[PDB]
Design a protein around this ligand. Structure first.
Ligand code: PLP
Ligand code: PLP
Lengths: 424, 424
């Protein structure tokens, strides 16, 4: 019997039962935080050597470029080739920037708004209405960019194999629709991964806008919890093969590989998109930081060197995800109140509680000294229409803290569920 | 006797002789370049240690921030404080960014265009016409930004004490005029420096636009050629004292102090302007590269350490400027065909030749294998109405190449002038 099928008296009693546990949880006086989707100090220690790279006397890229001096908008060949080899794409596709791929995403959107993109009839700022496809649950920092530009964000379900392509293929037939966000591998926060079939559908679909763009933000391209690395779909190539070469603006970075905020970002896109981008970037400045790019190239040496680092991250993160999953199972399984993802990579676990209770869960956790990301945080304008989803971030705390914190979260899920069904 | 005073016969003899020298110059098959204000490899060698900084295990800012991990939009206190001490301003004024000040100048104009600034009644995108004041000769990369945005650029003289304030003060009465560029110390390319009197006038003037900004791009704030450091006017503080606290967006950077394109940029402005800036920068991303900021704080240690570096730069650069000036004196002075700046600091000499001939001098030079910046490059839209100005960049080449290159340039000046007088 799930809680929802408890009779009126049984759920009342269950409510009194679980409230005793909640009282015990509060008497612990916890101060714990499950909100931070960032690497732990242990993981940042792996790149300690990078703090001393590229090192005295070592300032030449593989083509002879003095990385210390001005110029070059594309990034240095050394780091571009490593990433091309890692991702299995032609090097010509790859541009290497500064330390933030979000910065580049914002820029390409803002330039499409101001100037138009290379396929635009006119700039997006001339449109009465710009709409933007948002697979949910998704990444708050993506949705914040589109919200700040005033675009009407239209949600679609993020499914196990990627965004619901029936819904997307329909929505893009509206010319107001100028693009879409997706995190295609270990998606933030669902852990779901776009299949080859879904990528093909995104690549071949017809859009009403001539200048429609998919942001393919492959932020977790190599970020496995296991020994297996996920497939890297050459999405820019798929767009080229389908006859929509300019469709995909693809990104990734080293922020959860080396240093979070001081890594190197990459922008992968078609020939025509890259000329558009560097023509605007060349007015914004002289070009990106080549020294940090050479530092990175030296640290990794080659693509296998990147995978070797990712195995260290996996070994550090795996027990943390395991603890969270173990606790959710032991406390909640029997009750039919919640569903959670079981990801094989990325930085998050996505938890769905009783619809109408996610805000209450986060409130109860807060009264108990446990910080959860708020209800709706993974949705545009922070509006989850079912008030059910919560994001869990296991990476930073030690396992002992995760155990305590999740045990408390589970109690909160149960109490909120008991309140909800008792009030019905 | 000046060349203009030669009679037909004497200018005909002079013309044949200088033409012969020019032919002799072309026969050398030179490949020399006086176009880019890039530090030499000798100057870049000074920061060899920075390639190893901040070094293994050293990753905490002075307030405890782990610089390896996400967050913080303002830059770290370590570098902000050093720059504050260097410039004699309160640390609260200073924001520290990534490796390009141009990126930030671009960004604040683009955001004023898109969103409006904090004093705007509406975005500049909604204006029929945006005008922008451009002291000339000035910096080509500034003008490119406002050209790219479609702003109508209105020229005013850059005089020895700064922009023509009688002209500026009149132009700013037009509400179409939204801002102005200035390089206020050792200006690119005149070497001129804004006086306290001119600064005060800029701070007190009445503008018809409520959201007018001066870009005070102090790229050469400490960039002495003589080891005497120029005055640092606290321009933000002067706007605050005059009752126009939001007027100034001030910038500087370490691109010509440490590593050109891998240094640290600074944005100095009022509390309300900083809040507006970081509000938008926080949507564009999670914040700047804190590791490079700590590397720079470790490299310099303090304000005096910055000043010691600048003295090394002066020792490297001063004999290159001196050689250029010696050649201009010995080849051109007697003929009354040219005038040039004699800068106490900065990266350039500004050369004015016979009006109507600058484009010809640059074409002659290019035929002879000597790259000069084109005619008009220090003017908006590359439009020098007198076709007389050329910019010379002595920093990159060794003195021996400067000698050869400048002797050639002088022969080009004289041939162009001889053609001009003979054609009358
Ligand atoms: C999907 C996604 N993209 C981008 C980022 C940030 O990347 P960067 O640090 O290169 O801006 C994150 C950080 O969590 C993320 O989850
Ligand atoms: C006036 C001026 N501003 C800004 C810059 C460069 O700024 P950054 O390298 O910090 O973009 C230069 C480069 O010399 C310059 O002459």
């Amino acid at each position: 019997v799930s809680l929802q099928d408890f009779d009126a008296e049984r759920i009342g009693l269950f409510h009194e039962d679980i409230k005793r546990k909640f009282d015990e949880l509060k008497s612990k006086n916890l101060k714990l935080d499950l909100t931070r989707g960032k690497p732990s100090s242990e993981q940042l220690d792996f790149a300690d050597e990078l703090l001393a790279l590229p090192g005295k006397g070592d300032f030449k890229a593989a083509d002879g470029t003095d990385v210390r001096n001005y110029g070059g908008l594309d990034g240095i060949v050394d780091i571009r080739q490593i990433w091309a080899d890692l991702l299995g794409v032609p090097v010509e596709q790859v541009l290497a920037g500064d330390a933030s791929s979000l910065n580049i995403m914002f820029d390409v959107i803002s330039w499409s708004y101001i100037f138009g993109n290379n396929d635009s009839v006119q700039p997006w700022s001339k449109e009465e209405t710009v709409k933007w496809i948002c697979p949910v649950p998704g990444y708050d920092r993506h949705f914040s960019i589109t919200e700040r530009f005033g675009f009407e964000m239209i949600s679609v379900p993020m499914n196990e194999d990627g965004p619901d392509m029936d819904a997307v293929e329909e929505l893009v037939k509206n010319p107001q629709v100028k693009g879409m966000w997706v995190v295609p591998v270990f998606s933030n926060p669902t852990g779901f991964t776009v299949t080859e079939d879904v990528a093909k559908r995104l690549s071949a679909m017809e859009t009403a806008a001539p200048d429609f763009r998919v942001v393919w933000d492959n932020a977790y391209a190599v970020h496995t919890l296991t020994d297996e690395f996920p497939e890297v779909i050459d999405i820019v190539g798929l767009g080229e093969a389908a006859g929509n070469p300019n469709r995909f603006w693809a990104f990734t970075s080293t922020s959860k590989i080396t240093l979070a905020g001081a890594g190197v970002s990459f922008f992968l896109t078609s020939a025509e998109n890259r000329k558009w981008y560097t023509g605007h970037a060349g007015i914004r400045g002289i070009g990106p930081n080549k020294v940090n790019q050479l530092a990175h190239a030296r640290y990794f040496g080659d693509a296998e060197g990147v995978r070797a680092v990712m195995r260290k991250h996996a070994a550090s993160l795996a027990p943390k995800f395991n603890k969270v999953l173990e606790i959710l199972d032991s406390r909640l399984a029997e009750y039919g109140v919640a569903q959670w993802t079981v990801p094989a990579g990325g930085y998050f676990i996505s938890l769905d509680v009783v619809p109408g209770t996610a805000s209450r869960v986060a409130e109860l956790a807060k009264e108990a000294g446990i910080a959860l990301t708020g209800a709706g945080s993974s949705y545009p304008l922070r509006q989850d229409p079912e008030n059910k989803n919560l994001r869990l971030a296991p990476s930073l705390p030690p396992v002992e803290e995760l155990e305590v914190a999740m045990d408390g979260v589970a109690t909160c899920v149960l109490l909120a569920a008991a309140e909800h069904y008792a009030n019905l």
